[PDB]
Design a protein around this nucleic acid. Structure first.
Ligand SMILES: [Mn+2]
Ligand SMILES: [Mn+2]
Ligand SMILES: [Mn+2]
Length: 430
DNA sequence: ATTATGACGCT
DNA sequence: AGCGTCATG
């Protein structure tokens, strides 16, 4: 009753750029705007691998992970932009720099947690309190929410998309008790007003469109963000969770799309998140562990406590390249040359990071895959990172991995290497 | 032969 | 520390 906590204390948003790398290329090249287009890495093998797809191209069935030659079978007029190549490898600097543009705008509204190159969580609880005390009981006008969907509405007793959006928003705003400065539904609504302002600022100042979710925690905000893309935002209220989850496949919730979610489905004999409510917390902990079990028990009721961490910058800076098949590295000269290429890119990114962010990495992690190993990383080893020098970094990486060469001769490398990875970690204030 | 990352949990 | 899982631009 009055003591069963409901996880409605916070207002959390998730802002995610629409087809981010495509928008970066469309800003640069106006000929790609409002076109089916995709961004690719490399070109020789099957036209390159697609990593981002405009919504026009998605309508034709084009997806990430598709080879461009196959995409062109679905969409013959598909336009392609290629990721820059530097030192023999894909270079994603343009998109990291665009990401920083967006993150700096978001940070003007609230402290953010960078979750990926194109998305960030926002804790809006305090900004919402401020805007509410500024409003002093004045209701919220639909005009302040021009791109907002209210999940679950309209309901109860026009055949256009925008018309339904407005119908749902009108039902929501009529139901609102705008006199209660502590009503969670009102708090979410003001949160959505702020997120409209943040998304307007991002588009005005960068040209980039985004979507967003507003709810009481990170998982619901992420899920909400996906419900109405592109260029829209969605409010998922605490009350909307039972209906939403009653037909939600377990795999759609962040962290359940892999082996654990498959085991929830198989062990419990269920398919939808709502079905988790029938198990006790101890039952779920017995199957899935203390932490997972408690998390599932609360999450299926809409409750999750993971904080929005104050972290705008990545914790690690890394450089990786695969060498599939005939391109696998089979000589020590090859291995050394590619370690040097990766280390030169790493040095350049690290030096810029130290100037921009007043910090230095102190640990170098070297990861490799040997041909014939199914695991994505065959071996991972750390060493000290004491100088931002690519030649020293690559020599140290070689020292750390040279024991893996099973070749009797030192000129050859066996089994050949199918991936190299250098990662700088353990940052300290400079 | 989706590839280039990056966060985080486990032991 | 090194390995596994999850996400996916
Ligand atoms: Mn996105
Ligand atoms: Mn994203
Ligand atoms: Mn995506």
């Amino acid at each position: 009753g009055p003591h069963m906590a409901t996880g409605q204390d916070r207002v959390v948003a998730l802002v995610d750029m629409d087809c981010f790398f495509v928008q970066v290329e469309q800003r640069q090249n106006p000929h790609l705007r409002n076109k089916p287009c995709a961004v690719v890495q490399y070109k020789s093998w099957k036209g390159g691998g697609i990593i981002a797809v405009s919504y026009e191209a998605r309508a034709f069935g084009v997806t990430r992970s598709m080879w461009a030659d196959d995409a062109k079978k679905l969409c013959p007029d598909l336009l392609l932009a290629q990721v820059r190549e530097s030192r023999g490898k894909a270079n994603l600097t343009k998109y990291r720099e665009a990401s920083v543009e967006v993150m700096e705008i978001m940070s003007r509204f609230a402290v953010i947690e960078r979750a990926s190159i194109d998305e960030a969580y926002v804790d809006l609880t305090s900004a919402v309190q401020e805007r509410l005390q500024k409003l002093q009981g004045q209701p919220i006008s639909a005009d302040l929410l021009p791109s907002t969907y209210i999940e679950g509405l309209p309901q109860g007793p026009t055949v256009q998309k925008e018309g339904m959006r407005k119908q749902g928003l009108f039902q929501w705003l009529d139901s609102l008790q705008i006199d209660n400065l502590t009503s969670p539904d009102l708090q979410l609504t003001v949160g959505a007003v702020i997120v409209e302002e943040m998304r307007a600022a991002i588009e005005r100042e960068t040209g980039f469109q985004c979507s967003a979710g507003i709810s009481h925690n990170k998982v619901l905000a992420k899920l909400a963000c996906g419900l109405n893309k592109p260029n829209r935002q969605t409010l998922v209220s605490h009350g909307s969770v039972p209906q939403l989850f009653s037909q939600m496949p377990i795999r759609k919730i962040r962290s359940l799309g892999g082996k654990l979610g498959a085991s929830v489905i198989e062990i419990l004999g269920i398919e939808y998140m709502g079905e988790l409510t029938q198990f006790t917390e101890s039952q779920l902990q017995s199957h899935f562990g203390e932490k997972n079990g408690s998390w599932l028990y609360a999450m299926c009721r809409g409750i999750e406590h993971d904080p929005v961490k104050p972290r705008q910058l990545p914790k690690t800076i890394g450089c990786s390249k695969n060498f599939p098949g005939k391109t696998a590295l089979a000589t020590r000269e090859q291995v050394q040359w590619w370690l040097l290429q990766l280390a030169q890119e790493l040095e350049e990114r690290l030096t810029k990071d130290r100037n921009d962010n007043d910090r230095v990495a102190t640990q170098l992690v070297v990861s490799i895959r040997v041909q014939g190993d199914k695991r994505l990383s065959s071996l991972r080893r750390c060493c000290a990172l004491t100088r931002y020098d690519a030649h020293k970094m690559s020599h140290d990486a070689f020292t750390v991995i040279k024991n893996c060469n099973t070749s009797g001769i030192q000129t050859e490398w066996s089994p050949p290497l199918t991936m190299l990875f250098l990662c700088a970690t353990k940052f300290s204030a400079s």
